[model samples]
Target: APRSVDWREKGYVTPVKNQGQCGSAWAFSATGALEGQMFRKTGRLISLSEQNLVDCSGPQGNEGCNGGLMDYAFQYVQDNGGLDSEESYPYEATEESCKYNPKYSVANDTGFVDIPKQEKALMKAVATVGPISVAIDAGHESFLFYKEGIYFEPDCSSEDMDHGVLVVGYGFESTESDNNKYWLVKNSWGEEWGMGGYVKMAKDRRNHCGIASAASYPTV
Candidate 1:
C-alpha cells in the first residue's frame, strides 16, 4: 500500500534541535526516531538525550562530536539502561564530557530493527513502526543551508552517509508546475531552517541522498 501520514500533525514530533558544528547528527536523528517510537507506544512524549549517546557510548565506538552510527546508539541506550530527557540531560550542542545520571533516565529502548533496502519496506516501517533513524549523503554544504521544498539533491550518492536524519512520514503533492513525492524529514539544524528544522526530500528516486540506504529505529 502507498501509505501517507504526518507524524507531526499526529502529535509525535519532538522539538527541533541544533547540533552546531559537531558531527553528532547521528545521535540527534537516532534520538528523534526513538522519541517518536516511544511516544507512539506509551502515549507520552519524552525528549531523549543525544548527549547521553555522545558521551557514554564512546567505549562502544561512538564519537562524542566527531561521528557515530545509529545502531550503536541503540545498543548503548539498551545496554546502558536508557536515555534521559532534554530537560534532564540538556543539550550543549558541542563536545562535552560524559555526565549522564541515572535519575535522568526517562526513556528506554528494547532494541531496534533494520528495514530492507526497498522503498516499500521503508514506507511500511514509517507507517507502522513510527519514524526511523536514517542516514544520507548530506556532505554537500548546500544541504546544510537548505530552507524549503522537497530537497532534490540528485548528485548525492548513497555511499557517503555523512549525516543522519529522521523520516517521520511520507506523502504525494502536486502543483501546477510539477508533482512531488517526498519524505517528511526532521533535521537537527534547529527549527530556524529548512521548513522549521525539517526537509521534505524527494522520495522514490533511487532513494535520493541515500534516505533509504541506512535506516533504523529504537524499540520502546
Candidate 2:
C-alpha cells in the first residue's frame, strides 16, 4: 500500500469532465466511479453520460443542474437498467428535460457499496473495488487555484461536504512535509482547472474534508 496507486495508469479512470456552471458534480463523480467498475467488469471503455443523470435522474430526488448526490445518481442507474453513453446523451452544462432512451443505455450497476467511515476502509475499497465517488470541500479560494501539489486544507470540513469529486487513486508523496498521504482525486471542473482536472487531496488519515465520510462505488 505504500507504493503509489493511480487508477488512471491502470486504465480505469476516464477523461476529466467539466460540470460548467451546473452543480452536477454529483453526476460526474458517480459517472467516473460507475465507468471504472464498468471497465473492470466488461473490459470496455465507454464513457457514460452525466447529462443523462442530469436530465433524467430526478425521480430518485436529484436535481438536474442545481445539485445532487452521487449515491442517488448511482441508484438511478441501477433502477433504470443503465445510463446512456455520452455520445447519445452528451453534456450540455445546463439543465435539460430528460430525453433518455433505454435503447441508448451503455452501462448500469447492480447496486452500490459504501466504505466504512474511516480512511483505511476507504483505501481498501479503492484498492480492491477500483475508483470511487467522493465529496469534498471545494469552496476554499486556494482550491480553485490549485496546481500541482498535495492539497491539504487543514481548516476544511468533515461534516459539510459540498462538492462531489472522484477518487481514482491514492499513494504517498515523500517530497512534501506536512502533506504526504494523498488520494488522486478527479474533478469535473475541466482539465484547465487543478492538475489537468485532478488533485492529490490530503489523505492524512483524518478523512480530510469528508472525502472518506461519504465515499462509495457502483457494483457493476
Top of the candidates by TM-score? 2
The digit string of per-residue lDDT tens for model 1 on 1-220 reads: 5447788888788879998888899999888888888888889988888888887888778887989999899988888887788888877877777888888788888888898777678888888878888998887866878888778875799767788899989887774222478898899988898899988888887878888889888877
Q: Per-candidate TM vs. native? A: 0.93, 0.95
Q: Write the per-residue lDDT of candidate 2 for residues 1-220, one digit (tens) a residue.
A: 5456788887898888898999899999999999999899988888989999999889998988889998899899988987999999999999888899989988978888888778888888888878989888777988989998888776889888999998888877787544478899999999999999989888865778889888998887
Alpha-carbon local distance difference test for all models: 0.84, 0.87
lDDT of 1 at 91: 76
In candidate 2, how many Å is residue 38 off?
0.5
**Candidate 1 structure, TM-score to reference:** 0.93
RMSD of 1: 2.0
| Regions of model 1 farther than 4 Å from truth | 175-179
Error of 1 at 81 (Å): 1.1
